[PDB]
Amino acid sequence: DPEALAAEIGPVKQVSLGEQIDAALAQQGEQLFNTYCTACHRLDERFIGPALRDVTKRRGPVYIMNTMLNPNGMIQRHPVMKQLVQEYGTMEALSEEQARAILEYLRQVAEN
Numbered sequence: 001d002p003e004a005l006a007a008e009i010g011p012v013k014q015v016s017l018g019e020q021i022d023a024a025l026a027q028q029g030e031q032l033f034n035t036y037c038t039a040c041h042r043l044d045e046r047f048i049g050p051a052l053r054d055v056t057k058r059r060g061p062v063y064i065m066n067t068m069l070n071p072n073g074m075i076q077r078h079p080v081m082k083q084l085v086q087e088y089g090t091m092e093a094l095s096e097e098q099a100r101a102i103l104e105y106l107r108q109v110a111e112n
């Protein structure tokens with residue numbers, strides 16, 4: 001359900017995930033996360049936005065990718081996100097490549 005709606009919102013439609021984490025991709029993701037995402041997020045605590053360590057357990061990859069790549073579309077149209085906006089309020093322009101690296105880091109940290 002929520003992945004299909006995330007796909008319709010776009011731009012990402014599908015993400016096939018490796019059985020194993022690509023450690024080198026994740027490391028680039030780590031650097032990007034610490035550049036861009038830590039302005040508002042932490043792994044274990046609430047900050048400006050929700051804690052993210054376990055985001056890949058509660059969400060799928062298309063939702064996560066389109067949150068990064070199309071935040072306005074997600075806020076306007078995705079029921080999960082609309083609720084979060086009500087809770088956290090209203091407040092970057094990554095490439096898909098960058099977003100996919102960050103996704104890989106998010107998958108790695110959930111395994112920690």
Ligand code: HEC
Pocket residue numbers: 033036037038039040041048049050055059064067068075080081084085086087088089090091092094102
């Ligand atoms: C502050 C200016 C933010 C920056 C920079 C990033 N995010 Fe964010 N994110 C922020 C908020 C306030 C919220 C809640 C919704 C709202 O607009 O009020 C979010 C939400 C997310 C989510 C959804 C979490 C869930 O449990 O479903 C994800 C996956 C997310 N944010 C990821 C993320 C990443 C990876 C970022 C660096 C590229 C990033 N956000 C930046 C606020 C801000």
